[PDB]
Amino acid sequence: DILDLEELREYQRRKRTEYEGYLKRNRLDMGQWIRYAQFEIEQHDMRRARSIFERALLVDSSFIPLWIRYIDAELKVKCINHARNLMNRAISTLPRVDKLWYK
RNA sequence: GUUCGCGAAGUAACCCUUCGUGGACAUUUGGUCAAUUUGAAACAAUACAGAGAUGAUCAGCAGUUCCCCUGCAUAAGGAUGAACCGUUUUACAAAGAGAUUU
Ligand SMILES: [K+]
Ligand SMILES: [Mg+2]
Ligand SMILES: [Mg+2]
């Protein structure tokens, strides 16, 4: 498929334009947000992935699978202290959800 | 420059003409900006494609958007103005049961 960094940049531009267009036209599709963040984790660009999860939380902070995905994504890449800040924030905004406490 | 005053020479003329000189009058413009190509107007042309619903053709009216255009416009029109068609995996458990690590 992709043989060169410039070709990776072309691929990333096309996919980012696709995902951003759909999330512009309909921001409330949380699964679309999740798989865009997953795309950026596949690109190993954790800054972009974190930004997408944060924007998704700004669209809807009450949606528990989005929180769990973000926390698990931080832990999967050994970013434990980021995960600690994130989980503390998660319980701080939603203290009555048992799943976040257990996580 | 005009004018008030005082000295020198016309004109012993104290006013008029000239020269020297003290004072008053009048007091800070304009630029966000330089005169052709390299600080960004658009159509048109050319080639190829081509018409929302669906079996076919067409009237529309909306909605979402970090697209706007025409219009005095909160009217109306722009193909129903366009973009929309794609992509889709975990808040993941319980009971068994068969191969097997220990
Ligand atoms: K029509
Ligand atoms: Mg209309
Ligand atoms: Mg419309």
Q: How far apart are CA A14 and CA A82, in angstroms?
A: 29
Per the listing, tokens 């992935």 go with A49
Beta-carbon contacts of residue A55 (< 8 Å; ≥ 6 apart): A33
| Residue A75 dihedral angles phi and psi, to the nearest 5° | -70, -35
Amino acid at A75: L
What are the b/e assignments for A2-30, b being 16+ CB within 10 Å?
eeeeeeeeeebeeebeebeeebeeeeeee
Q: How far apart are CA A93 and CA A52, in angstroms?
A: 19
Amino acid at A59: V
| Three-state helix/strand/coil letters over A35-100 | HHHHHHHHCCCHHHHHHHHHHHHHHCCCCHHHHHHHHHHHHHCCCHHHHHHHHHHHHHHCCCCHHH
**Angle at the Cα of A63 (from A71 to A33), degrees rounded to 5?**
75
Contact A90, A71 (CB under 8 A): yes
- How many angstroms is it from A26 CA to the middle of ligand 1? 25
- How many angstroms is it from A5 CA to the middle of ligand 2? 45
Task: Strand B: list protein residues with Cβ under 7 Å.
Answer: A 18-27, 29, 31-32, 34-35, 38, 64-65, 68-69, 72, 97-99
Task: Give the number of residues written for chain A.
Answer: 103
- How many angstroms is it from A25 CA to the middle of ligand 3? 15
Method: cryo-EM
